[PDB]
Amino acid sequence: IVGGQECKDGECPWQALLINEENEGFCGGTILSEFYILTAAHCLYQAKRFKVRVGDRNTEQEEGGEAVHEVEVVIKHNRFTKETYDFDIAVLRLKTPITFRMNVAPACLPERDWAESTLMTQKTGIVSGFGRTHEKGRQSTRLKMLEVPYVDRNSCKLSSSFIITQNMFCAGYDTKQEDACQGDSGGPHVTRFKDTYFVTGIVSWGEGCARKGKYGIYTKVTAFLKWIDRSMKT
Amino acid sequence: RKLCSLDNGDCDQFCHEEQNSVVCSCARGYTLADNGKACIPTGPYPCGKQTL
Ligand SMILES: C[C@@H](C(=O)N1CCOCC1)N1CC[C@H](NS(=O)(=O)/C=C/c2ccc(Cl)s2)C1=O
């Protein structure tokens, strides 16, 4: 995350972190339930073997809330393509159930029509992660979050050098120096409604981070709510 | 601005228009309260709530 602020105690409890064999975070995820994590399909090519950490806000210290979970099943959308990052969505079934606690709780899955008419027409959503704090920098050791305005679909397509499909939406800022970034990929985009936070996006791609006239591109979760529900049933 | 378009139909969470009437419902792990509008967490750590 570029700009924004740290997640303070209890503020981003649905954040998950995919960690490689070296115990280094390379991608985010969203806790959907005690057994399931939502992530980006493209993240599944960034490590040979990985586990999921939850409850972590500061990767430099042991706060006591952290738990590492092994993955039992990786369910990648069969239409994912690396050329465009269309269908950039995957669900992970964990071997053991997540214990909810301070800093560890799921985000709500909304219903499609209501989310499209009511959540995605809100002014902003919130994106969070452990990724870089500047395009060229290192990963954050602190969990960060950022309010990101929803961006008009036309403007986003105008702005983009790569195709924006109907499985994507754009959020962030034209010129302001605030965006998701490398390592945030796969993480939560959530929208607050009456003090309840609903999954609306998965951090997917961008032309660098916080560049002028470029926006962040997110998987459109509302396009995949049936797919998610099916994946979680087995 | 009628029904669901008017302040989310007074619903805490999901609003649908059935016949010509607002119908509210809630995310999994919540139950709809007796007033048919509010959503009540069924147990600990309900989805979508920051932890206190
Ligand atoms: C354009 C895109 C890319 O390589 N694509 C996109 C279309 O599919 C083909 C490849 N790209 C260029 C490099 C970049 N990687 S990254 O910097 O890790 C991300 C950063 C992000 C910024 C905002 C969001 Cl959301 S995430 C990235 O995703």
PDB file of C-alpha atoms and ligand atoms in Angstrom:
ATOM      1  CA  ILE A   1       0.000   0.000   0.000  1.00  0.00           C
ATOM      2  CA  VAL A   2       1.175   3.505  -1.060  1.00  0.00           C
ATOM      3  CA  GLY A   3      -0.193   6.219   1.207  1.00  0.00           C
ATOM      4  CA  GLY A   4      -3.165   5.372   3.464  1.00  0.00           C
ATOM      5  CA  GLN A   5      -2.505   4.384   7.045  1.00  0.00           C
ATOM      6  CA  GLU A   6      -1.632   1.392   9.264  1.00  0.00           C
ATOM      7  CA  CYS A   7      -4.462  -0.943  10.195  1.00  0.00           C
ATOM      8  CA  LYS A   8      -4.897  -0.230  13.888  1.00  0.00           C
ATOM      9  CA  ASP A   9      -5.901  -2.931  16.357  1.00  0.00           C
ATOM     10  CA  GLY A  10      -8.886  -4.929  15.042  1.00  0.00           C
ATOM     11  CA  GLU A  11      -9.473  -2.789  11.945  1.00  0.00           C
ATOM     12  CA  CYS A  12      -8.532  -5.218   9.118  1.00  0.00           C
ATOM     13  CA  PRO A  13      -9.320  -8.597  10.679  1.00  0.00           C
ATOM     14  CA  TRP A  14     -10.149 -10.335   7.335  1.00  0.00           C
ATOM     15  CA  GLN A  15      -6.619  -9.803   5.933  1.00  0.00           C
ATOM     16  CA  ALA A  16      -4.684 -13.002   5.116  1.00  0.00           C
ATOM     17  CA  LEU A  17      -1.053 -13.186   3.947  1.00  0.00           C
ATOM     18  CA  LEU A  18       0.296 -15.868   1.622  1.00  0.00           C
ATOM     19  CA  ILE A  19       3.788 -16.778   2.778  1.00  0.00           C
ATOM     20  CA  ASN A  20       6.428 -18.664   0.847  1.00  0.00           C
ATOM     21  CA  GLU A  21       8.911 -21.293   2.079  1.00  0.00           C
ATOM     22  CA  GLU A  22      11.106 -18.498   3.503  1.00  0.00           C
ATOM     23  CA  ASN A  23       8.149 -17.217   5.592  1.00  0.00           C
ATOM     24  CA  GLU A  24       7.999 -14.073   3.397  1.00  0.00           C
ATOM     25  CA  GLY A  25       4.636 -12.574   2.302  1.00  0.00           C
ATOM     26  CA  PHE A  26       4.199 -12.462  -1.463  1.00  0.00           C
ATOM     27  CA  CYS A  27       0.405 -11.906  -1.813  1.00  0.00           C
ATOM     28  CA  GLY A  28      -2.693 -11.063   0.275  1.00  0.00           C
ATOM     29  CA  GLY A  29      -6.010 -12.856   0.704  1.00  0.00           C
ATOM     30  CA  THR A  30      -9.412 -12.301   2.363  1.00  0.00           C
ATOM     31  CA  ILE A  31     -10.780 -14.581   5.097  1.00  0.00           C
ATOM     32  CA  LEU A  32     -14.213 -15.782   3.945  1.00  0.00           C
ATOM     33  CA  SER A  33     -14.950 -18.362   6.688  1.00  0.00           C
ATOM     34  CA  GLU A  34     -13.097 -20.651   9.089  1.00  0.00           C
ATOM     35  CA  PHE A  35     -11.978 -22.861   6.156  1.00  0.00           C
ATOM     36  CA  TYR A  36     -11.722 -20.573   3.118  1.00  0.00           C
ATOM     37  CA  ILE A  37      -9.535 -17.787   1.816  1.00  0.00           C
ATOM     38  CA  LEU A  38     -10.216 -15.668  -1.232  1.00  0.00           C
ATOM     39  CA  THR A  39      -7.238 -14.729  -3.342  1.00  0.00           C
ATOM     40  CA  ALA A  40      -6.055 -13.898  -6.886  1.00  0.00           C
ATOM     41  CA  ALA A  41      -5.392 -16.759  -9.294  1.00  0.00           C
ATOM     42  CA  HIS A  42      -2.218 -15.032 -10.493  1.00  0.00           C
ATOM     43  CA  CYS A  43      -0.751 -15.342  -6.971  1.00  0.00           C
ATOM     44  CA  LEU A  44      -0.699 -19.126  -7.309  1.00  0.00           C
ATOM     45  CA  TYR A  45       2.240 -18.845  -9.727  1.00  0.00           C
ATOM     46  CA  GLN A  46       4.427 -16.843  -7.340  1.00  0.00           C
ATOM     47  CA  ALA A  47       5.406 -19.772  -5.107  1.00  0.00           C
ATOM     48  CA  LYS A  48       5.804 -23.544  -5.384  1.00  0.00           C
ATOM     49  CA  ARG A  49       4.499 -24.215  -1.897  1.00  0.00           C
ATOM     50  CA  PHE A  50       2.889 -21.656   0.408  1.00  0.00           C
ATOM     51  CA  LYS A  51       0.858 -21.393   3.607  1.00  0.00           C
ATOM     52  CA  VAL A  52      -1.595 -18.755   4.872  1.00  0.00           C
ATOM     53  CA  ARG A  53      -0.917 -16.483   7.851  1.00  0.00           C
ATOM     54  CA  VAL A  54      -3.721 -14.654   9.704  1.00  0.00           C
ATOM     55  CA  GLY A  55      -3.898 -12.251  12.661  1.00  0.00           C
ATOM     56  CA  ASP A  56      -0.628 -10.521  11.770  1.00  0.00           C
ATOM     57  CA  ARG A  57      -0.342  -6.732  11.782  1.00  0.00           C
ATOM     58  CA  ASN A  58       3.373  -6.379  12.287  1.00  0.00           C
ATOM     59  CA  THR A  59       5.489  -9.149  10.779  1.00  0.00           C
ATOM     60  CA  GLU A  60       8.507  -8.103  12.909  1.00  0.00           C
ATOM     61  CA  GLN A  61       6.901  -8.935  16.271  1.00  0.00           C
ATOM     62  CA  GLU A  62       4.906 -11.786  17.794  1.00  0.00           C
ATOM     63  CA  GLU A  63       1.622 -10.234  18.981  1.00  0.00           C
ATOM     64  CA  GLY A  64       0.111 -13.642  19.885  1.00  0.00           C
ATOM     65  CA  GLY A  65      -2.876 -13.495  17.519  1.00  0.00           C
ATOM     66  CA  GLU A  66      -1.023 -14.968  14.524  1.00  0.00           C
ATOM     67  CA  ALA A  67      -1.718 -18.438  13.132  1.00  0.00           C
ATOM     68  CA  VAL A  68      -0.226 -20.174  10.090  1.00  0.00           C
ATOM     69  CA  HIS A  69      -2.489 -22.509   8.155  1.00  0.00           C
ATOM     70  CA  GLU A  70      -1.650 -25.086   5.576  1.00  0.00           C
ATOM     71  CA  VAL A  71      -3.656 -25.206   2.393  1.00  0.00           C
ATOM     72  CA  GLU A  72      -5.580 -28.431   1.623  1.00  0.00           C
ATOM     73  CA  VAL A  73      -7.143 -27.539  -1.749  1.00  0.00           C
ATOM     74  CA  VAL A  74      -6.366 -24.750  -4.225  1.00  0.00           C
ATOM     75  CA  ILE A  75      -9.390 -23.877  -6.399  1.00  0.00           C
ATOM     76  CA  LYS A  76      -8.338 -21.635  -9.292  1.00  0.00           C
ATOM     77  CA  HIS A  77     -10.884 -20.245 -11.775  1.00  0.00           C
ATOM     78  CA  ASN A  78     -10.492 -22.455 -14.887  1.00  0.00           C
ATOM     79  CA  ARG A  79     -10.780 -19.382 -17.128  1.00  0.00           C
ATOM     80  CA  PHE A  80      -7.893 -17.462 -15.558  1.00  0.00           C
ATOM     81  CA  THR A  81      -5.455 -16.170 -18.205  1.00  0.00           C
ATOM     82  CA  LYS A  82      -2.045 -14.588 -17.582  1.00  0.00           C
ATOM     83  CA  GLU A  83      -2.293 -12.495 -20.754  1.00  0.00           C
ATOM     84  CA  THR A  84      -5.036 -10.232 -19.438  1.00  0.00           C
ATOM     85  CA  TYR A  85      -5.557 -11.380 -15.791  1.00  0.00           C
ATOM     86  CA  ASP A  86      -9.227 -11.932 -16.692  1.00  0.00           C
ATOM     87  CA  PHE A  87     -10.895 -14.267 -14.172  1.00  0.00           C
ATOM     88  CA  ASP A  88      -8.210 -13.408 -11.654  1.00  0.00           C
ATOM     89  CA  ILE A  89      -9.785 -15.364  -8.748  1.00  0.00           C
ATOM     90  CA  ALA A  90      -9.023 -18.369  -6.579  1.00  0.00           C
ATOM     91  CA  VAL A  91     -10.306 -19.900  -3.375  1.00  0.00           C
ATOM     92  CA  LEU A  92      -8.141 -21.807  -0.821  1.00  0.00           C
ATOM     93  CA  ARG A  93      -9.494 -24.508   1.508  1.00  0.00           C
ATOM     94  CA  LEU A  94      -7.391 -24.762   4.631  1.00  0.00           C
ATOM     95  CA  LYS A  95      -6.396 -28.076   6.302  1.00  0.00           C
ATOM     96  CA  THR A  96      -7.391 -26.708   9.756  1.00  0.00           C
ATOM     97  CA  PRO A  97     -10.094 -24.150  10.681  1.00  0.00           C
ATOM     98  CA  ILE A  98      -9.154 -20.552  11.471  1.00  0.00           C
ATOM     99  CA  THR A  99      -9.751 -19.533  15.062  1.00  0.00           C
ATOM    100  CA  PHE A 100     -11.496 -16.165  15.013  1.00  0.00           C
ATOM    101  CA  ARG A 101     -10.228 -13.661  17.566  1.00  0.00           C
ATOM    102  CA  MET A 102      -8.931 -10.136  17.816  1.00  0.00           C
ATOM    103  CA  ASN A 103      -7.588  -9.314  14.324  1.00  0.00           C
ATOM    104  CA  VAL A 104      -8.931 -12.542  12.788  1.00  0.00           C
ATOM    105  CA  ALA A 105     -12.476 -12.499  11.413  1.00  0.00           C
ATOM    106  CA  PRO A 106     -14.155 -12.985   8.020  1.00  0.00           C
ATOM    107  CA  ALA A 107     -15.437 -10.330   5.647  1.00  0.00           C
ATOM    108  CA  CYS A 108     -19.087 -10.732   4.526  1.00  0.00           C
ATOM    109  CA  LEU A 109     -19.964 -11.959   1.060  1.00  0.00           C
ATOM    110  CA  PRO A 110     -22.722  -9.778  -0.329  1.00  0.00           C
ATOM    111  CA  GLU A 111     -25.540 -10.696  -2.701  1.00  0.00           C
ATOM    112  CA  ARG A 112     -24.847  -9.728  -6.295  1.00  0.00           C
ATOM    113  CA  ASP A 113     -27.574  -7.278  -7.242  1.00  0.00           C
ATOM    114  CA  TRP A 114     -27.522  -5.406  -3.960  1.00  0.00           C
ATOM    115  CA  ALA A 115     -23.722  -5.174  -4.040  1.00  0.00           C
ATOM    116  CA  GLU A 116     -23.750  -3.777  -7.595  1.00  0.00           C
ATOM    117  CA  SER A 117     -26.491  -1.241  -6.905  1.00  0.00           C
ATOM    118  CA  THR A 118     -25.599  -0.323  -3.340  1.00  0.00           C
ATOM    119  CA  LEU A 119     -21.980  -1.157  -2.477  1.00  0.00           C
ATOM    120  CA  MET A 120     -20.294  -0.440  -5.769  1.00  0.00           C
ATOM    121  CA  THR A 121     -22.086   2.891  -6.133  1.00  0.00           C
ATOM    122  CA  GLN A 122     -20.686   4.011  -2.766  1.00  0.00           C
ATOM    123  CA  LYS A 123     -18.021   6.704  -2.943  1.00  0.00           C
ATOM    124  CA  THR A 124     -15.119   4.494  -1.757  1.00  0.00           C
ATOM    125  CA  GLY A 125     -13.858   1.052  -0.830  1.00  0.00           C
ATOM    126  CA  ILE A 126     -10.894   0.016   1.293  1.00  0.00           C
ATOM    127  CA  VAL A 127      -7.892  -1.965   0.113  1.00  0.00           C
ATOM    128  CA  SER A 128      -5.351  -3.409   2.540  1.00  0.00           C
ATOM    129  CA  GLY A 129      -2.060  -5.284   2.542  1.00  0.00           C
ATOM    130  CA  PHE A 130       1.606  -5.815   3.378  1.00  0.00           C
ATOM    131  CA  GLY A 131       2.880  -4.823  -0.089  1.00  0.00           C
ATOM    132  CA  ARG A 132       5.312  -2.052  -1.032  1.00  0.00           C
ATOM    133  CA  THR A 133       4.917   1.510   0.269  1.00  0.00           C
ATOM    134  CA  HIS A 134       6.345   2.913  -2.987  1.00  0.00           C
ATOM    135  CA  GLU A 135       6.683   1.377  -6.447  1.00  0.00           C
ATOM    136  CA  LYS A 136      10.442   0.779  -6.096  1.00  0.00           C
ATOM    137  CA  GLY A 137      10.583   0.009  -2.336  1.00  0.00           C
ATOM    138  CA  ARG A 138      10.412  -2.968   0.031  1.00  0.00           C
ATOM    139  CA  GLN A 139       7.302  -4.672   1.448  1.00  0.00           C
ATOM    140  CA  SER A 140       5.710  -3.156   4.510  1.00  0.00           C
ATOM    141  CA  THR A 141       6.349  -4.942   7.754  1.00  0.00           C
ATOM    142  CA  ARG A 142       3.085  -3.248   8.911  1.00  0.00           C
ATOM    143  CA  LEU A 143      -0.418  -4.034   7.675  1.00  0.00           C
ATOM    144  CA  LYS A 144      -1.748  -0.984   5.862  1.00  0.00           C
ATOM    145  CA  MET A 145      -5.163   0.110   4.585  1.00  0.00           C
ATOM    146  CA  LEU A 146      -6.320   2.789   2.120  1.00  0.00           C
ATOM    147  CA  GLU A 147      -9.655   4.335   1.105  1.00  0.00           C
ATOM    148  CA  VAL A 148      -9.930   4.097  -2.669  1.00  0.00           C
ATOM    149  CA  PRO A 149     -12.638   5.893  -4.651  1.00  0.00           C
ATOM    150  CA  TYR A 150     -14.540   3.779  -7.162  1.00  0.00           C
ATOM    151  CA  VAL A 151     -13.572   4.940 -10.642  1.00  0.00           C
ATOM    152  CA  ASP A 152     -15.990   5.520 -13.505  1.00  0.00           C
ATOM    153  CA  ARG A 153     -15.751   2.582 -15.832  1.00  0.00           C
ATOM    154  CA  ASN A 154     -15.359   4.669 -19.013  1.00  0.00           C
ATOM    155  CA  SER A 155     -12.566   6.798 -17.530  1.00  0.00           C
ATOM    156  CA  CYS A 156     -10.743   3.717 -16.421  1.00  0.00           C
ATOM    157  CA  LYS A 157     -10.923   2.109 -19.866  1.00  0.00           C
ATOM    158  CA  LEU A 158      -9.775   5.402 -21.392  1.00  0.00           C
ATOM    159  CA  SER A 159      -6.812   5.486 -18.992  1.00  0.00           C
ATOM    160  CA  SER A 160      -5.661   1.903 -19.488  1.00  0.00           C
ATOM    161  CA  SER A 161      -3.076   0.420 -21.841  1.00  0.00           C
ATOM    162  CA  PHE A 162      -4.509  -3.028 -21.175  1.00  0.00           C
ATOM    163  CA  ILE A 163      -8.026  -4.367 -21.654  1.00  0.00           C
ATOM    164  CA  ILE A 164     -10.467  -3.861 -18.739  1.00  0.00           C
ATOM    165  CA  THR A 165     -12.929  -6.780 -18.902  1.00  0.00           C
ATOM    166  CA  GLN A 166     -16.303  -7.086 -17.236  1.00  0.00           C
ATOM    167  CA  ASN A 167     -14.620  -9.207 -14.540  1.00  0.00           C
ATOM    168  CA  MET A 168     -12.693  -6.144 -13.411  1.00  0.00           C
ATOM    169  CA  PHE A 169     -13.280  -2.697 -11.986  1.00  0.00           C
ATOM    170  CA  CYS A 170     -10.987   0.227 -11.245  1.00  0.00           C
ATOM    171  CA  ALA A 171     -10.437   2.095  -8.022  1.00  0.00           C
ATOM    172  CA  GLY A 172      -7.978   4.656  -6.669  1.00  0.00           C
ATOM    173  CA  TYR A 173      -6.766   8.065  -7.782  1.00  0.00           C
ATOM    174  CA  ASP A 174      -5.858   9.865 -10.984  1.00  0.00           C
ATOM    175  CA  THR A 175      -2.859  11.788  -9.599  1.00  0.00           C
ATOM    176  CA  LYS A 176      -2.908  11.516  -5.786  1.00  0.00           C
ATOM    177  CA  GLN A 177      -0.071   9.299  -4.514  1.00  0.00           C
ATOM    178  CA  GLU A 178      -2.179   6.482  -3.002  1.00  0.00           C
ATOM    179  CA  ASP A 179      -2.717   2.989  -4.468  1.00  0.00           C
ATOM    180  CA  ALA A 180      -2.242  -0.719  -3.790  1.00  0.00           C
ATOM    181  CA  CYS A 181       1.149  -2.017  -4.989  1.00  0.00           C
ATOM    182  CA  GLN A 182       3.337  -5.109  -5.454  1.00  0.00           C
ATOM    183  CA  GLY A 183       2.708  -7.768  -2.755  1.00  0.00           C
ATOM    184  CA  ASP A 184      -0.816  -6.445  -2.061  1.00  0.00           C
ATOM    185  CA  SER A 185      -2.073  -8.618  -4.928  1.00  0.00           C
ATOM    186  CA  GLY A 186      -4.752 -11.142  -3.990  1.00  0.00           C
ATOM    187  CA  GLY A 187      -5.746  -9.028  -0.949  1.00  0.00           C
ATOM    188  CA  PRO A 188      -9.121  -7.543   0.164  1.00  0.00           C
ATOM    189  CA  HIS A 189     -11.055  -4.739  -1.382  1.00  0.00           C
ATOM    190  CA  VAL A 190     -14.010  -4.274   0.933  1.00  0.00           C
ATOM    191  CA  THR A 191     -16.857  -1.776   1.043  1.00  0.00           C
ATOM    192  CA  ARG A 192     -18.347  -0.539   4.305  1.00  0.00           C
ATOM    193  CA  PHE A 193     -22.113  -0.323   4.675  1.00  0.00           C
ATOM    194  CA  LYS A 194     -23.613   0.624   8.037  1.00  0.00           C
ATOM    195  CA  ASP A 195     -20.508  -0.491   9.942  1.00  0.00           C
ATOM    196  CA  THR A 196     -20.337  -3.887   8.171  1.00  0.00           C
ATOM    197  CA  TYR A 197     -17.588  -4.647   5.653  1.00  0.00           C
ATOM    198  CA  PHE A 198     -18.372  -6.675   2.491  1.00  0.00           C
ATOM    199  CA  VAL A 199     -15.904  -8.213   0.034  1.00  0.00           C
ATOM    200  CA  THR A 200     -16.215  -6.226  -3.225  1.00  0.00           C
ATOM    201  CA  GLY A 201     -12.834  -6.851  -4.888  1.00  0.00           C
ATOM    202  CA  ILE A 202      -9.538  -8.744  -5.003  1.00  0.00           C
ATOM    203  CA  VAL A 203      -6.338  -6.683  -5.589  1.00  0.00           C
ATOM    204  CA  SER A 204      -5.376  -7.729  -9.150  1.00  0.00           C
ATOM    205  CA  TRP A 205      -3.101  -5.457 -11.193  1.00  0.00           C
ATOM    206  CA  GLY A 206      -1.937  -1.957 -12.042  1.00  0.00           C
ATOM    207  CA  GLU A 207       0.514  -0.196 -14.364  1.00  0.00           C
ATOM    208  CA  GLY A 208       3.043   0.243 -11.552  1.00  0.00           C
ATOM    209  CA  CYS A 209       1.746   1.875  -8.370  1.00  0.00           C
ATOM    210  CA  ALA A 210      -0.011   5.242  -7.928  1.00  0.00           C
ATOM    211  CA  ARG A 211       1.137   6.469 -11.352  1.00  0.00           C
ATOM    212  CA  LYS A 212      -0.431   9.609 -12.822  1.00  0.00           C
ATOM    213  CA  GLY A 213      -3.489   8.863 -14.949  1.00  0.00           C
ATOM    214  CA  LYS A 214      -3.395   5.175 -13.866  1.00  0.00           C
ATOM    215  CA  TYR A 215      -5.792   3.395 -11.453  1.00  0.00           C
ATOM    216  CA  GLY A 216      -5.749   0.100  -9.487  1.00  0.00           C
ATOM    217  CA  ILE A 217      -7.494  -2.840 -11.167  1.00  0.00           C
ATOM    218  CA  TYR A 218      -9.476  -5.255  -9.000  1.00  0.00           C
ATOM    219  CA  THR A 219     -11.237  -8.560  -9.709  1.00  0.00           C
ATOM    220  CA  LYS A 220     -15.014  -7.905  -9.665  1.00  0.00           C
ATOM    221  CA  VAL A 221     -16.168 -10.193  -6.898  1.00  0.00           C
ATOM    222  CA  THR A 222     -19.822  -9.647  -7.720  1.00  0.00           C
ATOM    223  CA  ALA A 223     -19.207 -11.430 -11.041  1.00  0.00           C
ATOM    224  CA  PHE A 224     -18.098 -14.505  -9.099  1.00  0.00           C
ATOM    225  CA  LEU A 225     -20.439 -14.862  -6.152  1.00  0.00           C
ATOM    226  CA  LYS A 226     -22.070 -18.045  -7.499  1.00  0.00           C
ATOM    227  CA  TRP A 227     -18.597 -19.410  -8.356  1.00  0.00           C
ATOM    228  CA  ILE A 228     -17.337 -18.634  -4.850  1.00  0.00           C
ATOM    229  CA  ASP A 229     -20.406 -20.222  -3.225  1.00  0.00           C
ATOM    230  CA  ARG A 230     -19.888 -23.398  -5.299  1.00  0.00           C
ATOM    231  CA  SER A 231     -16.188 -23.556  -4.493  1.00  0.00           C
ATOM    232  CA  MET A 232     -16.932 -23.315  -0.747  1.00  0.00           C
ATOM    233  CA  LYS A 233     -19.537 -26.095  -0.878  1.00  0.00           C
ATOM    234  CA  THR A 234     -16.796 -28.490  -1.891  1.00  0.00           C
TER     235      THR A 234
ATOM    236  CA  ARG B   1     -36.467   7.162  -5.071  1.00  0.00           C
ATOM    237  CA  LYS B   2     -38.786   4.380  -3.861  1.00  0.00           C
ATOM    238  CA  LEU B   3     -38.344   1.171  -1.840  1.00  0.00           C
ATOM    239  CA  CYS B   4     -34.764  -0.175  -1.906  1.00  0.00           C
ATOM    240  CA  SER B   5     -33.666   3.007  -3.649  1.00  0.00           C
ATOM    241  CA  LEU B   6     -34.875   5.037  -0.646  1.00  0.00           C
ATOM    242  CA  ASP B   7     -32.281   4.655   2.105  1.00  0.00           C
ATOM    243  CA  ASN B   8     -31.745   0.927   1.342  1.00  0.00           C
ATOM    244  CA  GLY B   9     -35.416   0.354   2.212  1.00  0.00           C
ATOM    245  CA  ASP B  10     -34.499   0.872   5.909  1.00  0.00           C
ATOM    246  CA  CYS B  11     -32.686  -2.504   5.818  1.00  0.00           C
ATOM    247  CA  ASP B  12     -29.432  -3.082   7.719  1.00  0.00           C
ATOM    248  CA  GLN B  13     -28.010  -5.174   4.880  1.00  0.00           C
ATOM    249  CA  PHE B  14     -29.500  -6.686   1.701  1.00  0.00           C
ATOM    250  CA  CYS B  15     -32.621  -5.117   0.236  1.00  0.00           C
ATOM    251  CA  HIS B  16     -34.777  -6.736  -2.486  1.00  0.00           C
ATOM    252  CA  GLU B  17     -38.121  -5.575  -3.941  1.00  0.00           C
ATOM    253  CA  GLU B  18     -40.625  -8.456  -3.961  1.00  0.00           C
ATOM    254  CA  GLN B  19     -44.106  -7.838  -5.307  1.00  0.00           C
ATOM    255  CA  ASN B  20     -44.108  -4.071  -4.644  1.00  0.00           C
ATOM    256  CA  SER B  21     -42.641  -4.288  -1.157  1.00  0.00           C
ATOM    257  CA  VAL B  22     -39.161  -3.930   0.453  1.00  0.00           C
ATOM    258  CA  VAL B  23     -37.795  -7.269   1.647  1.00  0.00           C
ATOM    259  CA  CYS B  24     -34.642  -7.227   3.833  1.00  0.00           C
ATOM    260  CA  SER B  25     -32.224 -10.083   4.447  1.00  0.00           C
ATOM    261  CA  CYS B  26     -28.759 -10.565   6.006  1.00  0.00           C
ATOM    262  CA  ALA B  27     -25.345 -12.156   5.305  1.00  0.00           C
ATOM    263  CA  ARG B  28     -24.634 -15.666   6.529  1.00  0.00           C
ATOM    264  CA  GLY B  29     -24.096 -15.671  10.307  1.00  0.00           C
ATOM    265  CA  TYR B  30     -26.748 -13.017  10.930  1.00  0.00           C
ATOM    266  CA  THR B  31     -30.480 -13.445  11.498  1.00  0.00           C
ATOM    267  CA  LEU B  32     -33.139 -10.964  10.528  1.00  0.00           C
ATOM    268  CA  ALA B  33     -34.605  -9.302  13.584  1.00  0.00           C
ATOM    269  CA  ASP B  34     -38.331  -9.224  14.420  1.00  0.00           C
ATOM    270  CA  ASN B  35     -38.785  -5.859  12.758  1.00  0.00           C
ATOM    271  CA  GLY B  36     -37.702  -7.591   9.515  1.00  0.00           C
ATOM    272  CA  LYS B  37     -35.023  -4.935   8.964  1.00  0.00           C
ATOM    273  CA  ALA B  38     -32.129  -5.286  11.418  1.00  0.00           C
ATOM    274  CA  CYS B  39     -29.499  -8.046  11.185  1.00  0.00           C
ATOM    275  CA  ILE B  40     -28.469  -9.792  14.419  1.00  0.00           C
ATOM    276  CA  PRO B  41     -25.160 -11.721  14.639  1.00  0.00           C
ATOM    277  CA  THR B  42     -25.896 -15.343  15.505  1.00  0.00           C
ATOM    278  CA  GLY B  43     -22.670 -15.877  17.374  1.00  0.00           C
ATOM    279  CA  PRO B  44     -19.168 -14.609  18.004  1.00  0.00           C
ATOM    280  CA  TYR B  45     -16.979 -12.936  15.348  1.00  0.00           C
ATOM    281  CA  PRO B  46     -19.747 -12.274  12.788  1.00  0.00           C
ATOM    282  CA  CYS B  47     -18.552 -11.496   9.297  1.00  0.00           C
ATOM    283  CA  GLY B  48     -17.783  -7.907   8.353  1.00  0.00           C
ATOM    284  CA  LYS B  49     -17.238  -6.522  11.888  1.00  0.00           C
ATOM    285  CA  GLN B  50     -13.941  -5.009  13.034  1.00  0.00           C
ATOM    286  CA  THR B  51     -12.830  -6.845  16.163  1.00  0.00           C
ATOM    287  CA  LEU B  52     -13.035  -5.008  19.537  1.00  0.00           C
TER     288      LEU B  52
HETATM  289  C1  LIG C   1      -0.046  -4.255 -16.169  1.00  0.00           C
HETATM  290  C2  LIG C   1       0.247  -5.369 -15.155  1.00  0.00           C
HETATM  291  C3  LIG C   1       0.551  -6.653 -15.904  1.00  0.00           C
HETATM  292  O1  LIG C   1       1.716  -7.040 -15.939  1.00  0.00           O
HETATM  293  N1  LIG C   1      -0.480  -7.310 -16.500  1.00  0.00           N
HETATM  294  C4  LIG C   1      -1.890  -6.869 -16.454  1.00  0.00           C
HETATM  295  C5  LIG C   1      -2.839  -7.525 -17.466  1.00  0.00           C
HETATM  296  O2  LIG C   1      -2.527  -8.907 -17.521  1.00  0.00           O
HETATM  297  C6  LIG C   1      -1.244  -9.088 -18.117  1.00  0.00           C
HETATM  298  C7  LIG C   1      -0.138  -8.550 -17.204  1.00  0.00           C
HETATM  299  N2  LIG C   1       1.295  -4.998 -14.188  1.00  0.00           N
HETATM  300  C8  LIG C   1       2.558  -4.318 -14.455  1.00  0.00           C
HETATM  301  C9  LIG C   1       3.401  -4.712 -13.235  1.00  0.00           C
HETATM  302  C10 LIG C   1       2.344  -4.752 -12.115  1.00  0.00           C
HETATM  303  N3  LIG C   1       2.708  -5.524 -10.927  1.00  0.00           N
HETATM  304  S1  LIG C   1       2.574  -4.906  -9.437  1.00  0.00           S
HETATM  305  O3  LIG C   1       3.205  -3.624  -9.385  1.00  0.00           O
HETATM  306  O4  LIG C   1       2.976  -5.909  -8.513  1.00  0.00           O
HETATM  307  C11 LIG C   1       0.871  -4.597  -9.214  1.00  0.00           C
HETATM  308  C12 LIG C   1       0.565  -3.442  -8.601  1.00  0.00           C
HETATM  309  C13 LIG C   1      -0.824  -2.942  -8.329  1.00  0.00           C
HETATM  310  C14 LIG C   1      -1.190  -1.598  -8.253  1.00  0.00           C
HETATM  311  C15 LIG C   1      -2.560  -1.424  -7.969  1.00  0.00           C
HETATM  312  C16 LIG C   1      -3.199  -2.676  -7.872  1.00  0.00           C
HETATM  313 CL1  LIG C   1      -4.883  -2.879  -7.615  1.00  0.00          CL
HETATM  314  S2  LIG C   1      -2.142  -3.998  -8.081  1.00  0.00           S
HETATM  315  C17 LIG C   1       1.149  -5.273 -12.878  1.00  0.00           C
HETATM  316  O5  LIG C   1       0.202  -5.861 -12.385  1.00  0.00           O
END
